[PDB]
Design a protein around this ligand. Structure first.
Ligand SMILES: *[C@@H]1O[C@H](CO)[C@@H](O)[C@H](O)[C@H]1NC(C)=O
Ligand SMILES: *[C@@H]1O[C@H](CO)[C@@H](O)[C@H](O)[C@H]1NC(C)=O
Ligand SMILES: *[C@@H]1O[C@H](CO)[C@@H](O)[C@H](O)[C@H]1NC(C)=O
Lengths: 174, 48, 174, 174
């Protein structure tokens, strides 16, 4: 994990999250549960599916072995044909293995950024209102309803109004 | 099969045998015709 | 955008920025405008140009098809030559397409880091003096001249002096 | 350096650090010196060593040139054999050079993340207690012993106790 989002900050996955890939866990007065944001997991689905097709699409043109026979008096040509056919297979099996090996690393690293950037925007929206615990948890100050959690979920967090109540909560703990 | 059992019953060699098998890879149909009918050899003897 | 600098924090490009690739927008008392820093865009130019040459330099050695003819009685050899020549072209056209496809991703991701790291150092210099808005904007406290903007631009931001006026501005809003 | 850990924040290496790859420099009342954390450098050693073997393991199957001779009356076949043998070598020498070129970039970028994430967790543990200077330096408030430095080194930094003394130190400078 180069970006460090997987493990690092958040080292524990959510088994209860089956709706999508990336989501938010809310623990407020109005119960608790798991919810998903579509704009993040849909792009990952489209990107990965495009990658999967790209491996198949690019590998459409490949060497196709064909049978040739010789009459026991021309063995230099038979050896030449044998070394050419398996030589091309050796070249093509290396490209397929190398392509699979590299694209496996891409998908794991691509997923790192998406959850990392998902964390980055939530920190960038909450900012002073919440505190950073270390495992991805944010503890905000205002005593709003569950709709504010949805407001965080649609990426529409208006700052000013919530600042005054939070700054009254930054001065009572100080 | 890799090792045919009944191949060239009478001893000998098939000239350009591998050349002919290359042509068979591109042919999908064969038909027999009476190019030179038997019993037309009245001088030479064909049955024996 | 794995690093998230393109879109993410800054989702809007500057059409008025034609001098260079990466730069700073200043909006102060002494007018407003766009300015560029050479140390960031020059390294990107050198890095990309080196990459462009590297594709050409590496592809110098390639299979070159040559004409061979046969006398209608040797078709196994003619088929062997035909399958060998186009087989090598199929191998080489895959390497060229794969190389172009991967290096396109490198350039886009390489540009992500340069603007991301350009943002990182400005945040690392301004620190408490300015506030982070969310779209890459920094709103500092001191009422200095346009030279301070250039001071941010040459990466020479002395902290102590500006701290006292800013901390007098951290206590009047609190 | 896409992640920016090498140069960027920390542009100066430590020549006195020979025990390992990544470590911490402590400058407190109980002397000063360099110390290493094994969990970071061991994974880098294992990852790089696995990469080095992978280049050798994948390159096990390769074209092997063999000698064939012709009788001066069949030059089309000799030219066909000559163009096939060196053509395969040209294909394989490109794969080896491209693989080495790409994996060199991976190792440099892989090392960027490890030291970057090492910095990220220390900032994430110290948080308000220390101040970020810019060159990777953290200046904490509490006057604890060298064991607290080791506590930072084993990644076990309990926050609450140290918060009260530090917040008494956030109010005396303000
Ligand atoms: C979700 O976000 C969109 C963004 O435009 C907004 O229109 C909508 O009101 C949000 N949902 C709720 C329940 O507020
Ligand atoms: C630009 O930065 C360099 C860094 O050494 C400094 O010497 C120079 O004075 C700066 N420019 C101005 C106008 O101060
Ligand atoms: C090192 O960290 C481990 C983490 O479990 C802890 O058990 C140990 O006490 C730490 N070392 C010291 C000297 O405290």
């Amino acid at each position: 994990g180069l970006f460090g989002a997987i493990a690092g900050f958040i080292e524990g996955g959510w088994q209860g999250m089956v709706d999508g890939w990336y989501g938010y866990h809310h623990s407020n007065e109005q119960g608790s549960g798991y919810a998903a944001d579509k704009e993040s997991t849909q792009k990952a689905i489209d990107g990965v599916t495009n990658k999967v097709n790209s491996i198949i699409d690019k590998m459409n043109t490949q060497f196709e072995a064909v049978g040739r026979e010789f009459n026991n008096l021309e063995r230099r040509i038979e050896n030449l044909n044998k070394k050419m056919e398996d030589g091309f297979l050796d070249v093509w099996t290396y490209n397929a293995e190398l392509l699979v090996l590299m694209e496996n690393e891409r998908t794991l690293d691509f997923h790192d950024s998406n959850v990392k950037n998902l964390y980055d925007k939530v920190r960038l929206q909450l900012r002073d209102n919440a505190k950073e615990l270390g495992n991805g948890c944010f503890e905000f100050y205002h005593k709003c309803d569950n709709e504010c959690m949805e407001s965080v979920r649609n990426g529409t967090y208006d700052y000013p109004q919530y600042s005054e109540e939070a700054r009254l909560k930054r001065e009572e703990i100080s | 099969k890799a090792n045919p059992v009944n191949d060239l019953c009478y001893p000998g060699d098939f000239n350009d045998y591998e050349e002919l098998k290359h042509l068979l890879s591109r042919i999908n149909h064969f038909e027999k015709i009476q190019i030179i009918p038997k019993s037309s050899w009245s001088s030479h003897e064909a049955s024996l």
